[PDB]
Amino acid sequence: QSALTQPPSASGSLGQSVTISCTGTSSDVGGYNYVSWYQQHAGKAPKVIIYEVNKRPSGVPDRFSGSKSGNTASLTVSGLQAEDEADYYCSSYEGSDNFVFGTGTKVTVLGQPKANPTVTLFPPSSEELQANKATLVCLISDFYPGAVTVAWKADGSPVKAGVETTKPSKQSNNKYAASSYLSLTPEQWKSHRSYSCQVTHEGSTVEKTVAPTECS
Amino acid sequence: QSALTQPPSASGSLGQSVTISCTGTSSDVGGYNYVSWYQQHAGKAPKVIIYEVNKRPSGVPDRFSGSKSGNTASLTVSGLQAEDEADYYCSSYEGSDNFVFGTGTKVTVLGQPKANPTVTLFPPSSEELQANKATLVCLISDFYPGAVTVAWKADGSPVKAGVETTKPSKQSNNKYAASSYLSLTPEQWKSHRSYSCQVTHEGSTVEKTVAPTECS
Ligand SMILES: COC(=O)[C@H](Cc1ccccc1)NC(=O)[C@@H](N)CC(=O)O
Numbered sequence: 001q002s003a004l005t006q007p008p009s010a011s012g013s014l015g016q017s018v019t020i021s022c023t024g025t026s027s028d029v030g031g032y033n034y035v036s037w038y039q040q041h042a043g044k045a046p047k048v049i050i051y052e053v054n055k056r057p058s059g060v061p062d063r064f065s066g067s068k069s070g071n072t073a074s075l076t077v078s079g080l081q082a083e084d085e086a087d088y089y090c091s092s093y094e095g096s097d098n099f100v101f102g103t104g105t106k107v108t109v110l111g112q113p114k115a116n117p118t119v120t121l122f123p124p125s126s127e128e129l130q131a132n133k134a135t136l137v138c139l140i141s142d143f144y145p146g147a148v149t150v151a152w153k154a155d156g157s158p159v160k161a162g163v164e165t166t167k168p169s170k171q172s173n174n175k176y177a178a179s180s181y182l183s184l185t186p187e188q189w190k191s192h193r194s195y196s197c198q199v200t201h202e203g204s205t206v207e208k209t210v211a212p213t214e215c216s
Numbered sequence: 217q218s219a220l221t222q223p224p225s226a227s228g229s230l231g232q233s234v235t236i237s238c239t240g241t242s243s244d245v246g247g248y249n250y251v252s253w254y255q256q257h258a259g260k261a262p263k264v265i266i267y268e269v270n271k272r273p274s275g276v277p278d279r280f281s282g283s284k285s286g287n288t289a290s291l292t293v294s295g296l297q298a299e300d301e302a303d304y305y306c307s308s309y310e311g312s313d314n315f316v317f318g319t320g321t322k323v324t325v326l327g328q329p330k331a332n333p334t335v336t337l338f339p340p341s342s343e344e345l346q347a348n349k350a351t352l353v354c355l356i357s358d359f360y361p362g363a364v365t366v367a368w369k370a371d372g373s374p375v376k377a378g379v380e381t382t383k384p385s386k387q388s389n390n391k392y393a394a395s396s397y398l399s400l401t402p403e404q405w406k407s408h409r410s411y412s413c414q415v416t417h418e419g420s421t422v423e424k425t426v427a428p429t430e431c432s
């Protein structure tokens with residue numbers, strides 16, 4: 001019926017350790033030894049890092065370890081790293097082949113070094129302009145925290161109009177990425193001098209420009 | 217690792233009957249009758265919706281069926297109810313360590329017409345190769361539901377590492393558009409026949425190839 005009361009948040013520090021614990025009743029959790037832990041990364045397939053309460057599949061490292069106490073098991077992670085930022089779930093065998101999960105926890109490894117973005121501007125394909133099209137993409141990546149402001153200007157004065165930015169998403173490196181594209185026209189692209197993309201991240205503005213190259 | 221595989225998106229309207237797949241071939245023993253189907257709404261904890269190919273726990277409406285087709289675990293949400301729009305995972309238990317998890321299928325009760333992705337592959341601008349670096353940006357715009365799958369190949373052969381994908385973000389036209397990039401040294405760049413990016417999205421599989429002919 002109900003889930004296994006799991007806290008909604010935790011916080012650790014690079015090298016430290018954090019114990020995420022979920023609780024239930026003496027019917028599902030409290031009765032057996034099948035309290036397992038999952039871990040999916042921000043809207044992405046789950047993964048198992050614990051089973052039979054205190055155990056791990058031949059992949060999860062030695063920082064992962066949970067153990068059942070009362071009617072509540074609990075996982076803890078030391079050697080805390082940035083890549084550990086994620087939502088964890090707790091399961092537990094119920095009655096008639098029934099399995100129950102926790103209410104979820106989102107652990108945030110604090111103390112994570114701050115990064116300034118790396119803006120890469122791109123000129124329309126050698127083939128984009130062949131189909132009578134032209135769109136520029138401002139690749140903002142490798143930055144942290146996860147908030148940024150992307151802006152576009154024409155030959156010098158604002159261009160805001162026909163610009164689509166996307167939310168910032170974590171990468172494989174535990175930092176963020178994010179693009180922003182402009183849709184021009186070969187003609188709305190040629191009849192100019194230089195377009196530029198501006199990325200303001202934590203009081204640190206970056207700004208690359210672009211000009212037409214004949215070849216690619 | 218992602219042995220089990222499934223559509224990026226599977227959508228329909230009310231009444232319809234979407235049919236998610238779990239074609240986790242990867243050959244396997246081709247005899248793992250333990251396939252589960254976790255349903256994961258947004259902002260909530262997953263939950264076994266079907267288990268053992270086709271067994272259903274207490275609760276689950278008959279609207280759901282489960283089955284293995286040679287090497288294909290499928291699920292069907294006939295009469296697609298509104299409250300059925302979520303992410304639908306799938307799995308097979310292996311070696312008590314290998315809990316392989318599908319990749320996730322996000323159902324969507326159609327809210328607007330279907331919009332296929334508009335991928336445009338970008339090569340590293342000359343000025344960038346003038347900084348001893350290459351970045352290939354794959355821009356995917358104008359689609360729906362907001363669920364895409366991106367693959368990378370260098371010379372036809374997959375590019376399993378160095379690739380980055382963003383998370384679908386609604387555009388001003390409420391049409392999703394994500395972006396994927398692959399960072400590589402000018403050498404890797406120049407040392408390959410042609411580079412290709414190819415997103416997935418409900419049947420269609422548009423792929424764009426880019427050759428390293430650059431001006432620098
Ligand atoms: C997979 O565990 C089992 O084989 C089944 C339960 C089950 C099977 C398939 C899907 C959900 C639940 N049996 C068990 O887990 C039991 N061996 C353990 C217990 O009674 O606590």
Ligand SMILES: COC(=O)[C@H](Cc1ccccc1)NC(=O)[C@@H](N)CC(=O)O
Pocket residue numbers: 048099250252264267268307308309315316
């Ligand atoms: C029915 O719920 C299950 O499948 C669970 C957990 C699980 C998690 C992720 C992927 C597959 C299985 N599986 C089981 O209980 C069994 N596969 C393990 C056992 O028999 O002890």
